[PDB]
Amino acid sequence: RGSFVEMVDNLRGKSGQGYYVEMTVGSPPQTLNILVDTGSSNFAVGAAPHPFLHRYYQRQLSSTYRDLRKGVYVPYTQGKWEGELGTDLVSIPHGPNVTVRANIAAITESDKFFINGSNWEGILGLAYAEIARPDDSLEPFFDSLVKQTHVPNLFSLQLCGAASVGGSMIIGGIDHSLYTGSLWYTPIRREWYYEVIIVRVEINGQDLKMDCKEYNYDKSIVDSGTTNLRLPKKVFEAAVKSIKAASSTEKFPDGFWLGEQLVCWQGTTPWNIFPVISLYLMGEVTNQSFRITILPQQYLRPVEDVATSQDDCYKFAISQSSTGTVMGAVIMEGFYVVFDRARKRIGFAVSACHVHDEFRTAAVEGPFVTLDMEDCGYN
């Protein structure tokens, strides 16, 4: 009840490949590493020997498997998985001491879904039923967990990272050792993705003076399943233009800002020429907001596997989007993030583990006065 020591440090991963938790599926239990994804709502796992997979769900061995006799084709903007739907017994060894009958999509075909060299063989969609495939009748895992057990309807994520990353996913609660200062809550605007409303943006304290509605076009979401802070092209333009201006003692190729090239130094990174980035999020109270600030340490990520270079090369991990803002790993790694489903809100605090230097720190600050925040939501 504020201390979940068993669950601390239960996230593992590799830079650029995401965070995974260990899960078991079936009877007797088959252990699998499962990507933690707040951007989708399906629990889907490798079920055939795709050569990139360390292991896979073997239904024939599970005595508790049930077939739903339904299939599902799930495409993304590059590329896809296809699966056979069913149920089985699932548990999280370094999570609550419980077993749950949940929906499972057994992946039988894919393209560009499994990553070569990755050490995970499935995905845990933790978002809501509205975006479940094939439809909202297919209950997501977390919903099933809460319904069948006494686990409270809340989880929290401390994505730390830095070739291997680490973190904690606290199921059913909050662990206070994971954050400093105070949690600040922003409303979940609708229960499909974890949608939130950005009401103001600053670069090094400087506003952007954009219609806040632009910031949330057509959506702003919190997503552990994406690396980048992804922005709508308009906001991206204004953002980069400002980041360029804040940054203009060094010249960088246009391709770097566009994610088309890496930039390398040899630990001689001029972190301090790079501005901090602040997003004000709708608060809990009318005309009240709060501020989250990330460092260049978050949006400039080291690219490990460059055979062609002996130096330290970095990627600009702020990119343009057509699905609205994606608050991904670049954002979340600054913070302890509480997905308070019970109260339709998302909490942020400074991560006890976030990476910084002796000059600037990731911050969560409040309160602020911000009028017309409702007009910031897109309809």
Ligand SMILES: C[C@@]1(c2cc(NC(=O)c3ccc(C#N)cn3)ccc2F)C=CSC(N)=N1
């Ligand atoms: C379901 C999915 C998805 C997400 C991912 N996630 C990742 O590979 C990934 C990689 C690095 C990081 C980080 N940090 C997070 N996620 C892979 C496949 C996939 F289909 C679709 C697009 S974006 C999203 N939220 N989830």
